């Protein structure tokens, strides 16, 4: 088969937890892209035809780690149906500089990261799908707030709202929101109550004031 490139030891944070190699590579049979993550020559995810199977992909920051940066992508399917929650692997900004240059994929003195992630992005294109990069004209925001008693980050992009990284990883679509209510109002925090066209309602709770503005101009996006 023809690999495209590959990173050594990525931390994989779901569907499974384990520092994995990442290989890109081009079906034999017809040419469609594949992503493999590998343990010494164990395949433990695969998914193939990625123009068709990966519903979205994202580049998104881990708050407060400007040298790491998340890979996030779902997908329809993957090999032997092991697993459904989406692709979170955390990449170290300047571990991967490296290793672009020893595969020769950029010159050494190139010092900026944003050069992989052009690399990459286009390498999905040329194999037909998208990885967005929404945090380098809208403006995408994040912040910390609860579902219930499991805190994660709440990622305002332009198409979607994702809440991670703990099992059940959410994704909306954020044409699928009806309406905002905001409840728990607080001289601090507030809690909001999304609802989507299907009637299902998801409520995210003590979110910083702050952010108020923000979520309201979001959600009356037209
Ligand atoms: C080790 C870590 O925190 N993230 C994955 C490391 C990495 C970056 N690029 C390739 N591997
Ligand atoms: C809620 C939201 O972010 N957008 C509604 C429409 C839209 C599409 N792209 C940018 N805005």
Same mark, same amino acid.
Do not use: W
């Given at each position: 088969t023809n690999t495209i490139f590959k990173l050594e030891g990525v931390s994989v944070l779901s569907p499974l937890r384990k520092k994995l190699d990442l290989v890109f590579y081009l079906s034999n049979v017809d040419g469609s892209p594949v992503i493999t993550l590998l343990k010494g020559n164990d395949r433990e995810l695969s998914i193939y035809q990625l123009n068709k199977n990966i519903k979205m992909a994202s580049f998104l920051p881990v708050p407060e780690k400007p040298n790491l940066i998340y890979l996030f992508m779902t997908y329809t399917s993957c090999e032997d149906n092991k697993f459904s929650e989406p692709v979170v692997m955390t990449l170290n900004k300047e571990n991967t500089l490296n290793q672009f240059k020893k595969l020769g994929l950029? @010159?050494?003195?190139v010092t900026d990261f944003e050069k992989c992630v052009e690399y990459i992005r286009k390498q999905a294109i040329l194999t037909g799908f998208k990885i967005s990069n929404?945090?380098?004209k809208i403006n995408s925001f994040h912040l910390q707030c609860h579902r219930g008693t499991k805190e994660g980050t709440l990622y305002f992009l332009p198409d979607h709202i994702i809440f991670g990284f703990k099992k059940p990883i959410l994704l909306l @679509?954020?044409? @699928? /929101?009806?309406s905002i209510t905001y409840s728990s109002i607080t001289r601090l925090t507030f809690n909001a109550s999304l609802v989507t066209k299907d009637g299902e309602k998801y409520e995210f709770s003590? /979110? @910083?004031?702050?952010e108020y503005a923000k979520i309201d101009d979001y959600v009356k996006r037209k």
């Open positions: 950029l @010159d050494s003195n929404p945090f380098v @679509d954020a044409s @699928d /929101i009806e003590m /979110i @910083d004031q702050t």
